[PDB]
Amino acid sequence: QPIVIKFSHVVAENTPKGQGALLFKKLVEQRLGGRVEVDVYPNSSLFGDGKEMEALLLGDVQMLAPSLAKFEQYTRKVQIFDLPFLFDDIQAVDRFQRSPQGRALLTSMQGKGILGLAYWHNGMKQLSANRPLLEPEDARGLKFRVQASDVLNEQFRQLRAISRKMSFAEVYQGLQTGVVNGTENTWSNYESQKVNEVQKYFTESNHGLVDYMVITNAKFWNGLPADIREELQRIMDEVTVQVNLEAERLNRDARQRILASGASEIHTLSPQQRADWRQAMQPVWQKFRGNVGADLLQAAEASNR
Ligand SMILES: C=C(CC(=O)O)C(=O)O
């Protein structure tokens, strides 16, 4: 009789998405009277990148919240969120997500059996490496780990660097062993996974973002009793507010803990240095302009107002 919802993810528990998954479980327990139960599998403990979606389509899991950079095998529209320097900050991405177009992207993969339920924020991305990254030319010849995204692969190729798509669980070992010597991520991801132990230099570039689309199997979700589906959506909407609030503070704490370690430095780009990094990376947009389309790019650019 109880409907079971298995929510798998790849991040540590002490994170926006980690706390969000646990909060969803808690609120379902406190409000659904045992009619729904939620199991949460963090840190790739059940499924890591890629495999998670294969499992979602098979029904081995009922809920995921993957980075918006990881949907190119289902749609090419969500690639917009990966374009470097498109969004000035999370407030901008939030505006885009709220737009009619941003809301419609939650159904962009419905024909493949994937239903989006919400956007969760994590934060802006920074750059890391074993050498200082002050000017774009510093990235040349480095090997950067990226999420499984052609946009992100091309971003570093544009900087004359090598890109290596790797699952999130593999980043630490990849950097520790030299398979990669740098990467990009939020302060939360870096500190939660202790990647600062293997990256001496960080650059607060805010050159992109890590945000998530909470997703489910359309067949499973659309097959739930209406009253339960609606209540679960209402809970999810409350959980979204909480995740979005904790994301900001968790990212600030993570930065402080990295700076306090003494084993890693952080360089903050001047507005002009940032413009130069933007100038060097923005050419990549031309490669995806066709996939995303002029309207989405217009809406995203308008979100910076
Ligand atoms: C974005 C991530 C992980 C995530 O926060 O879900 C990554 O870099 O693979």
Residue numbers in the entry: 25 to 329
Could you share sentences copied from the article?
Here, we demonstrate that a genetically linked tripartite ATP-independent periplasmic (TRAP) transporter (pa0884-pa0886), which is homologous to the known C4-dicarboxylate-binding TRAP system, is essential for growth on itaconate, but not for the closely related C4-dicarboxylate succinate. Using tryptophan fluorescence spectroscopy, we demonstrate that the substrate-binding protein (SBP), IctP (PA0884), binds itaconate but still retains higher affinity for the related C4-dicarboxylates. The structures of IctP bound to itaconate (1.80 Å) and succinate (1.75 Å) revealed an enclosed ligand-binding pocket with ion pairing interactions with the ligand carboxylates. The C2 methylene group that is the distinguishing feature of itaconate compared with succinate is accommodated by a unique change in the IctP-binding site from a Leu to Val, which distinguishes it from closely related C4-dicarboxylate-binding SBPs. Together, these data suggest that this transporter, which we name IctPQM, has duplicated from a canonical C4-dicarboxylate transporter, and its evolution towards itaconate specificity enables this pathogen to now access a key metabolite for persistence in the host.
The proximal (C1) carboxylate group forms a two-pronged ion-pair with the guanidino moiety of R169, a key characteristic of a DctP family SBP ligand interaction, further interacting with the ε-amino group of K94, the amide –NH2 of N209 and an ordered water molecule. Meanwhile, the distal (C4) carboxylate forms polar interactions with the charged amino group of the K41 side chain, the amide –NH2 moiety of the side chain of N213, the phenolic hydroxyl of Y236 and a further ordered water molecule. These polar interactions are supplemented by apolar interactions involving the side chains of V34, V35, S91, F192 and V234. The nearest neighbours of the methylene substituent are provided by the side chains of Q171, V234 and S91. This group is otherwise enclosed by the K94 side chain and a water molecule. The alteration from the larger leucine residue in DctP to the smaller valine in IctP suggests that V234 could be the primary adaptation in IctP that enables it to recognise itaconate with μM affinity. In an identical binding site, the larger L234 residue found in DctP would likely interfere with the accommodation of itaconate in the binding.
